[PDB]
Design a protein around this ligand. Sequence first.
Ligand code: FMN
Ligand code: FMN
Ligand code: FMN
Ligand code: FMN
Ligand code: CL
Ligand code: CL
Lengths: 184, 184, 182, 182
Amino acid sequence: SPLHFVTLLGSLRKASFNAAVARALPEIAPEGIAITPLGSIGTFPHYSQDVQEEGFPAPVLTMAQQIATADAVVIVTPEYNYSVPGVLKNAIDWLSRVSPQPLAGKPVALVTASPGMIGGARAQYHLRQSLVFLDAYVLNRPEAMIGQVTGKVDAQTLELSDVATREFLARQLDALAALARTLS
Amino acid sequence: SPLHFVTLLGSLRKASFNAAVARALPEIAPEGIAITPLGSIGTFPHYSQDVQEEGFPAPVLTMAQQIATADAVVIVTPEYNYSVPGVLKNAIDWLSRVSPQPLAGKPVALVTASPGMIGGARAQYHLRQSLVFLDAYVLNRPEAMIGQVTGKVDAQTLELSDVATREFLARQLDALAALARTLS
Amino acid sequence: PLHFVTLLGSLRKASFNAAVARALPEIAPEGIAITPLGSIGTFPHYSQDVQEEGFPAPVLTMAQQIATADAVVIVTPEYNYSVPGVLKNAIDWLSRVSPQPLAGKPVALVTASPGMIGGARAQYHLRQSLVFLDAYVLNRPEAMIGQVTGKVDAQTLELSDVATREFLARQLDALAALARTL
Amino acid sequence: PLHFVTLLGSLRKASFNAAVARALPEIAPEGIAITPLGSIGTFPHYSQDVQEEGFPAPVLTMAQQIATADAVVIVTPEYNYSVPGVLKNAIDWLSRVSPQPLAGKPVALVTASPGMIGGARAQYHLRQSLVFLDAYVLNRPEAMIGQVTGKVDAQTLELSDVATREFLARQLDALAALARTL
Ligand SMILES: Cc1cc2nc3c(=O)[nH]c(=O)nc-3n(C[C@H](O)[C@H](O)[C@H](O)COP(=O)(O)O)c2cc1C
Ligand SMILES: Cc1cc2nc3c(=O)[nH]c(=O)nc-3n(C[C@H](O)[C@H](O)[C@H](O)COP(=O)(O)O)c2cc1C
Ligand SMILES: Cc1cc2nc3c(=O)[nH]c(=O)nc-3n(C[C@H](O)[C@H](O)[C@H](O)COP(=O)(O)O)c2cc1C
Ligand SMILES: Cc1cc2nc3c(=O)[nH]c(=O)nc-3n(C[C@H](O)[C@H](O)[C@H](O)COP(=O)(O)O)c2cc1C
Ligand SMILES: [Cl-]
Ligand SMILES: [Cl-]
C-alpha cells in the first residue's frame, strides 16, 4: 500500500528554514510513501466573499484537489506573532470554503521550525483549533517542534542535515502513515 | 482632551456586517473622541521577508503611522475557522516588523461580529495572543462579541441600528478612552 | 457492544452539566451503554509528593474505567474562560497513571452554560491538554449548550429541551462511528 | 513602597517553581517587597454548594492579600499543555470573592520546566482566564525558564543560575513600572 503525502508550506522567503525542512521530508519518508510539495500559498488572493462569488481562484482549487486526492497532509510552517502566519491562515480560509472541503476527514501532521527555543509550538495549537472546524484528523504524537533550527540546516547548502531531527521526522511520517491507514 | 481612535477592519466584502459595525463607531463615540477608519488590509501583499528586504509596502507604513499617531485602535473583525481572518493576521504580521513597531504600548479594543451565537469569541483570544507579543494593551472589559449580528443591522440600509449594541459599544469606547488616558 | 463513560466537571448538586450527563444514558442510540465515572471531587489536589506515596485509590479506579471504555464523554461547565480547576486536576492525576488511560481514547466534549457562548472557550483549552494525552477528540458535531437555564426543568432537574436531546443523540452516534473506526 | 505577592502553582517540596519563587524576594529591586501568599493546596475543590456555606477561610485570606497588593507574580509549572488544575482551582475560588481581588491587578507570570518550552503553553491559557478577571498581565518581558534542571542546585534547592536571576530582576523592574503606571 503506497501512500502519497503532500506538504503545505507556511513561509514565502527563498532562504526559509521551514522550506528546507519540507524539502527533506521526501528523502526522509519511509519506503512506501511518496511526498510532494503543494503550490505556493503566495499565489492566493486575500480571502473575500466577493471574490469567492465571482469564482474560486484556480490555484485554490488546484490545491484543494491535490489535498483531497492525497492520503495525508504535512503542514510545515514558522510561527508568526505567537500564531500561524497570516498568509498560511489565508490559504486555510480559502480551502475551507471549497466544496467538498478538502481537509474534512484528512489525516494531517504539523511541523514547525523556529530559530528559537519554543520551536513554533504556539502556532501548532492555534492551527489545531482551526483544523477542528475543518474536521481534519491531526496527529497528536509525535509532535514536531524544531527549535534552534539554525543549527540543524547547514548554511549556503540549504539542507536539513541534523541526524536526530531526520530520525524524529521520519518516525512522525510513519505515525501519519499509520493514522491514514486506520481511517481508510 | 480630544482623543483620536482608528479602526482596523477584518473583512473585505462590501456587504460585511463587521464593516457596518465599524462605520457606526464614529456616530456612537462619546464627545471628545473622533474615530476614523484605516486603509484596507486588502492592499497589503502577503508577508515575505524577501519583500520586506526590498522595502516596506507603502500601505503598511501608512497604516503604521496612522496607528502610531492614534490614541487607540479598535479592531473589528469576523471570526474565520475559529480564529482570526488570515488577511487580518497578515496585516498584523506586516505591522509587527515595522520600526518602531506601532502597536507597542498602544491601547487596543477588540470587536467581533458573527451571525452565530459565539459572536466571534474564539477569534478575540487568538488575536490577544499575538497582541501580547506586540506589547499592545488590550481592554479586558467590556468584551464586545456581537452574536446574531444579522438581526442587529437592518438590511439594504447597511446600518447598525440595534439600540442595545450601540449602548454596549459606546460604553466600550469610554473604557478604551479611560485606558488610553491612563497609559498617557 | 459499545460502552461510553461520562466524566463530569461540576460538583454542585443542582449542576446543569450533571442534568445533561444524566440524560445521556437515556437518549443513547441502541447498542450503546453509557455509565457515569466517579466524582472528580474525591481526588486530592495533584502533587508529585502524594503520587510517590502511591496513587489515590479513586485515581486508579477512574483510570481503569476510562482505559477499558470504548470512549469518554466529558461534560463540564466553563469556569473563567477555561476548564474548571477541579476537572483539570482529575485530568492531571489521570495523565500520570501507570499506562495512561486516555492515550488513543475516543472523546467527545459537551459543555453547558446559562450564557450565549455555552462553554465554547472551555472546550478548546481542554482539547489542548487532550493532545498531549493523545486522546482522539471528536470534531463534529460540537456540543455547546448555551442558555441551558431554559432547557432544564428548574424542579426535576432534567433537561426538558427536546431539540437538545436529539442533538446529543447525534453526537453520540458520531462518537460511536469514531470509536469503531479507530 | 511597592508590595508584590507570589502565588505558587506546584505543591511538591522539591518544586523547581518554588525555588524560583523563593529567589524573587532576594533578587528584587530596592523599594520592592515581595512576599509569598499561602498554599493553593489548602483550598477545597471549588463547588457552588461549598461557596454557599460561606467561603473557605484561606480563600478570603488570599483574596485579601492579593487585593491590597500592588501586583501579583504567579509562578507555576505547566501540566498537560495548560495550567495545573490545583492552581486553576485557586483562581476559580478567587474569582467568586466578594469584590474580586484580581480586577485591575498588575500581574506577571513566570513558568519553569525541565524541557525546551519552559511552560510557555501554560502562560497563554492562564492569560485567557486573567482576561475575564480583568487582570493587567505584563507582556514584556515574558519569563519562561526551560531547562530548569541545570539552573537549580539539586541539593540546596536554590536557583544558582546567575543569568536567570538577572532576567527575573528585570521582569520585576518592568512589573513595577506597570504598577506605577496603573
Ligand atoms: C512577522 C514575524 C513574526 C514572527 N513571530 C515569531 C514568533 O512568534 N515566534 C518565533 O519563535 N519566531 C517568530 N518569528 C521568527 C521566525 O521564527 C523566523 O524568522 C523563521 O526562521 C521564519 O521561518 P522561515 O525560515 O521558514 O521563513 C517571526 C518572524 C516574523 C517575520
Ligand atoms: C472562510 C470562513 C470561515 C468562517 N469561520 C467562522 C467561524 O469560525 N465562526 C463563525 O461564527 N463564523 C465563521 N464564518 C462566518 C462569518 O462569521 C460570517 O460570514 C460573517 O458575516 C463574516 O463577517 P462579515 O459580514 O463582516 O464579512 C466564516 C466564514 C468564512 C467565509
Ligand atoms: C468560578 C466560576 C467561573 C465561571 N466562569 C464562566 C465563564 O467563563 N463563562 C460562562 O459562560 N460561565 C461561567 N461561569 C458560570 C457557569 O457557566 C454556570 O455557573 C453553570 O451553571 C455552571 O455549570 P453547572 O450548572 O453544571 O454547575 C462560571 C461560574 C463559576 C462559579
Ligand atoms: C501531571 C503533569 C503534567 C505535566 N505536563 C507538562 C507539560 O505539558 N509540559 C512540560 O514541559 N512539563 C510537564 N510536566 C512536567 C513539569 O514541567 C515538571 O514536573 C516540573 O518540574 C514541575 O514543576 P515543579 O518542579 O515546580 O514541581 C508535567 C508534570 C506533571 C506531573
Ligand atoms: Cl522574532
Ligand atoms: Cl460558517
